[PDB]
RNA sequence: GGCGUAAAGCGCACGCAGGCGGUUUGUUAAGUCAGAUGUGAAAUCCCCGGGCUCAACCUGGGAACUGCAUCUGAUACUGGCAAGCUUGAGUCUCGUAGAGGGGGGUAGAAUUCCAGGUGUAGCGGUGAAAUGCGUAGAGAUCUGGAGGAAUACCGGUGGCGAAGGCGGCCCCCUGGACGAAGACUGACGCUCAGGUGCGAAAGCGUGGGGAGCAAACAGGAUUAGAUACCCUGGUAGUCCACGCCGUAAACGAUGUCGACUUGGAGGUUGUGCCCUUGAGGCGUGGCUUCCGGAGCUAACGCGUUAAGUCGACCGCCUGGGG
RNA sequence: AAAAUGACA
């Protein structure tokens, strides 16, 4: 469920500052880390319908942020989708 | 004039929030009745009353609750005015044409025991009238010396006498009312906040309003 | 979410007088302050205040000539979902001229009695009776 | 114009196109507003006019044809561009309450059945009664064993979930809400046609399981008949795994998202200060039941969780039967 | 326990 140490690593790797939590880059990374870890969970618990609703909120939220970045900084945005790997 | 300060009151935990500009707080989760705001408006109506009492306005005093009942007969019937010490017969003001007939019947009823029907006929039809006399004299008293509709009403409980106000509100009669923490300020245009259900408190009101009636006519 | 903040500003006045409150307070904006300057002119309300730095919060004062209120009918006319613009000869009339209608002409905020006597015209911000 | 009860809110959510969009500064001039230029055939319409003896009827001048295009010029609003701003929305740290979900185990009460021991003549059932069970030992009672389903007490208009709904105890995968103090991102927001997902119980398909209940069915009784209610039995089903179905009085008969507007009695759940002095007292956040003021309206009633005052989008309604 | 029904004006 992306514990604190599992989160304290991504925020520094993607964020611009040691305390830069909240920028568009780090927010997306913290979602794709939950999303691409929850692939294993729903491999086993397939009919976990109630949890799956929470994931579809994560996937939906991520696309909302990436649209905002795409309208803001094209070079920064297309750098982001490849240093993480998505958008196919 | 905050001379005594003996009627903090508070009447309850609940309230009608329409007296928010008339309250403070106390440690018992209950609302302190203002005495600083009370003083100026209180003497306004006394000044107003003296302006109307000089033209013989037939002041009416309404005290119905048991505790303050007797002191109304010590203020209204004391000087010249009228009281309703016991329950208010619904419609006594707007339905005057019917209470008028019953007051006239009373005047016969009292004299039906002076020189009429007390001993010259059967007690089942002579004494029973006195049972109707006693039911009347406390249910309809000092108003027996009236000559029509009054011009100034004076009430103590703005809630316990909320139906006497409406008849007065129905006509044009201005009224002085001693509202409380639980009371309603609207309807009555001459607001006098303060605790009511205390003999040491009512004496402050009645004893210091009947004086203004006294000075109006002289 | 709030989308017509002007329609919010008027409603504070409506409920402020229904509750018989002395004054109201709400966040400030340049169009709002211009609106409140107009109502300061026509005697609907007394002076106002715009104290605020990062939360500029306008603070009006409601007016009671008698026990009653003064702003009897204040309604939003050109809402965002349907905006209406009027021209110099078709300016709306409120209670045969006894009220006013606020028009934001090309030369700043104004009322239909001064824009009519200036040859101008614009969007009908609201009505105030 | 409406949508609690008269016809009318999709069962619930996610969401592309579309609609709408906080606050400041600059700039553009597309919407918008102001003038002119050109065009808007004549007549008919309308104002002041004239001629037939009046009128109907002809006729002169205006005004109107709300329009569309260009040229000038205004910049308050909307839209575009750019730079910010923190209030909206989201992220981070600490902690809280939970029948929220998926999977795997295990306990104890009871019912049924099976193998036995004492034990006698009835048991069971009804408004009465009969069917039925029993001398082949029934019913009652004690011991041992096997199975499936459901979790008494706590338990409460208590809690969680978007809705459907969720209830013994433990474990490990997992979702969302809440609060204090802080830091960051800086419009990233609301709504949603067509789409996508979920969606009680019953039913369906392929396999398992089957104690108790029990549609269908049978016998007894009631009744004028009784294809019923009552009684004795009893099949699918109820239970599990995996795929369907997509409907309910799926109801608060009340779409989602904001802001504003007197009060009481509680519950539950964080919490930050005096009086940690022991109760407590003071505060304030989130959910929730009841009564009620203004207001609303056909009345019932609703009422800070509005059906009150407004703003944005979405669905639906047009006499009853057919 | 049993207790069904009553043309229109
Ligand atoms: Mg999350
Ligand atoms: Mg209608
Ligand atoms: Mg209906
Ligand atoms: Mg619904
Ligand atoms: Mg749909
Ligand atoms: Mg704006
Ligand atoms: Mg233009
Ligand atoms: Mg023409
Ligand atoms: Mg002529
Ligand atoms: Mg702009
Ligand atoms: Mg939505
Ligand atoms: Mg089923
Ligand atoms: Mg089956
Ligand atoms: Mg049966
Ligand atoms: Mg339906
Ligand atoms: Mg339901
Ligand atoms: Mg419905
Ligand atoms: Mg209520
Ligand atoms: Mg027949």
Q: What is the CATH number of the domain that holds C94?
A: 3.30.1490.10
Instruction: Give the H/E segment covering residue C57.
Output: strand C57-59
Is A71's CB less than 7 Å from nucleic acid strand D? no
Query: Measured between alpha carbons, how far is A54 from C44 in angstroms, rounded to an integer?
Result: 52
DSSP B114: I
- Alpha carbon distance, N-terminus to C-terminus of chain B: 24
Report the distance from CA of residue A35 to the C1' of nucleotide D12 in Å, as an integer. Answer: 24
Query: Measured between alpha carbons, how far is B161 from B61 in angstroms, rounded to an integer?
Result: 12
Token look-up 């692939």 returns: A39
Nearest to B60 by CA among B84, B24, B79: B84
Nearest to C72 by CA among C38, C52, C44: C44
Task: Note whether C17 and C32 are same-domain residues.
Answer: yes
Q: How many CB atoms lie within 10 A of CB A50?
A: 7
- Alpha carbon distance, N-terminus to C-terminus of chain A: 25
Token look-up 């007939």 returns: B101
Nearest to B157 by CA among B138, B183, B186, B139: B183
User: In Å, how far are B169, C30, C42, C85, C124 from C39, measured between CA atoms?
Assistant: 36, 15, 5, 21, 15
Is C117's CB less than 7 Å from nucleic acid strand D? no
- Those chains having 3 or more beta-carbon pairs within 8 angstroms of chain B are none
Instruction: Give the H/E segment covering residue C124.
Output: strand C123-128
Task: Note whether C66 and C84 are same-domain residues.
Answer: no
- Nominal resolution in Å? 3.1
Query: Residue A82 is encoded by which pair of tokens?
Result: 């490849």
Instruction: Give the H/E segment covering residue C100.
Output: strand C100-105
Task: Note whether C81 and C66 are same-domain residues.
Answer: no
DSSP B93: T
Nucleotides of D under 7 A from a protein CB: 13-16, 19-25, 31-35, 73-78, 85-88, 90-94, 100-103, 161-164, 173-176, 183-190, 197-199, 242-243, 257-265, 281-282, 293-294, 308-313
Is C119's CB less than 7 Å from nucleic acid strand D? yes
**Dihedral angle sign, alpha carbons of residues C19, C22, C27, C31:** positive
Task: Note whether C58 and C76 are same-domain residues.
Answer: no
Burial of A88 (0-12, 13-18, 19+ CB in 10 A): exposed
Nucleotide nearest to A4 (CA to C1'): D93
Q: State whether residue A6 is helix, strand or coil.
A: helix
* Domain count for chain C: 2
Query: Measured between alpha carbons, how far is C3 from C15 in angstroms, rounded to an integer?
Result: 19
Task: Note whether C50 and C90 are same-domain residues.
Answer: no
Query: Which phi-psi region, left, alpha or beta, contains residue B11 (left: φ > 0; alpha: ψ -120 to 50)?
Result: left
Q: How many CB atoms lie within 10 A of CB B83?
A: 23
Q: Which residues pair with B215 in a beta bridge?
A: none
Query: Residue C51 is encoded by which pair of tokens?
Result: 């104290």
- Domain range for C41 is 1-71
Residue where one domain finishes, among candidates C23, C49, C71? C71
Concatenated DSSP letters for B155-181? ES-TTTTHHHHHHHHHTT--EEE---S
Give the Å distance between the CA of C87 and the centre of ligand 16: 56
Interstrand relation of B175-177 and C74-76 (parallel, antiparallel or unpaired): unpaired
Query: Residue C56 maps to which CATH number?
Result: 3.30.1370.30
Query: Residue B201 is encoded by which pair of tokens?
Result: 């408190």
Q: Which residues pair with B78 in a beta bridge?
A: none
Query: Residue A17 is encoded by which pair of tokens?
Result: 């500052």
Burial of B201 (0-12, 13-18, 19+ CB in 10 A): buried
Nearest to B155 by CA among B139, B135, B138, B174: B174
Nearest to B41 by CA among B207, B185, B138, B198: B185
Nearest to A81 by CA among A12, A14, A19, A20: A14
Method: cryo-EM
Report the distance from CA of residue C112 to the C1' of nucleotide D178 in Å, as an integer. Answer: 52
Look up the CATH number of domain A1-88: 1.10.287.10
């Amino acid at each position: 469920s992306l514990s604190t140490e599992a989160t304290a690593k991504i925020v520094s790797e993607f964020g611009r500052d040691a305390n830069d939590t909240g920028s568009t880059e780090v927010q997306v990374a913290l979602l794709t880390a939950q999303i691409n870890h929850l692939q294993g969970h729903f491999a086993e618990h397939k009919k976990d319908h109630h949890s799956r609703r929470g994931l579809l909120r994560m996937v939906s939220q991520r696309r909302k942020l990436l649209d905002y970045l795409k309208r803001k900084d094209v070079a920064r945005y297309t750098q982001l989708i490849e240093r993480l790997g998505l958008r196919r | 004039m905050l001379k005594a300060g003996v009627h903090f009151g508070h009447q309850t935990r609940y309230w009608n929030p329409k007296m928010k500009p008339f309250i403070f707080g106390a440690r018992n989760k209950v609302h302190i009745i203002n005495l600083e705001k009370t003083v100026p408006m209180f003497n306004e109506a006394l000044a107003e009353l003296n302006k109307i009492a000089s033209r013989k306005g037939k002041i009416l005093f309404v005290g119905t609750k048991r505790a303050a009942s007797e002191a109304v007969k010590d203020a209204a019937l004391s000087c010249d005015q009228f009281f309703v010490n016991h329950r208010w017969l619904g419609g006594m003001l707007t339905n005057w044409k019917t209470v008028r007939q019953s007051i006239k019947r009373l005047k016969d009823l009292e004299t039906q025991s002076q020189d009429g029907t007390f001993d010259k006929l059967t007690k089942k039809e002579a004494l029973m009238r006195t049972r109707e006399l006693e039911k009347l004299e406390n249910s309809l008293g000092g108003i027996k010396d009236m000559g029509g509709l009054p011009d100034a009403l004076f009430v103590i409980d703005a809630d316990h006498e909320h139906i006497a106000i409406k008849e007065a509100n129905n006509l044009g009669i201005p009224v002085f009312a001693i509202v409380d923490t639980n009371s309603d300020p609207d309807g009555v245009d001459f607001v006098i906040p303060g605790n009511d259900d205390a003999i040491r408190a009512v004496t402050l009101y009645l004893g210091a309003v009947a004086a203004t009636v006294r000075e109006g006519r002289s | 979410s709030m989308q017509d903040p002007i329609a919010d500003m008027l409603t504070r006045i409506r409920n402020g007088q229904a509750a018989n409150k002395a004054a109201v307070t709400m966040p400030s904006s340049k169009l709002k302050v211009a609106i409140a300057n107009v109502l300061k002119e026509e005697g609907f309300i007394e002076d106002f205040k715009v104290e605020g730095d990062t939360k500029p919060e306008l603070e009006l004062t409601l007016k009671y000539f008698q026990g009653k209120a003064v702003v009897e009918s204040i309604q939003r006319v050109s809402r965002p979902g349907l905006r209406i613009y009027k021209r110099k000869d078709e300016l709306p009339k409120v209670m045969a001229g006894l009220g006013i209608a606020v028009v934001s002409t090309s030369k700043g905020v104004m009322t239909d009695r001064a824009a009519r006597q200036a040859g101008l015209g614009g969007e009908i911000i609201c009505y105030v009776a």
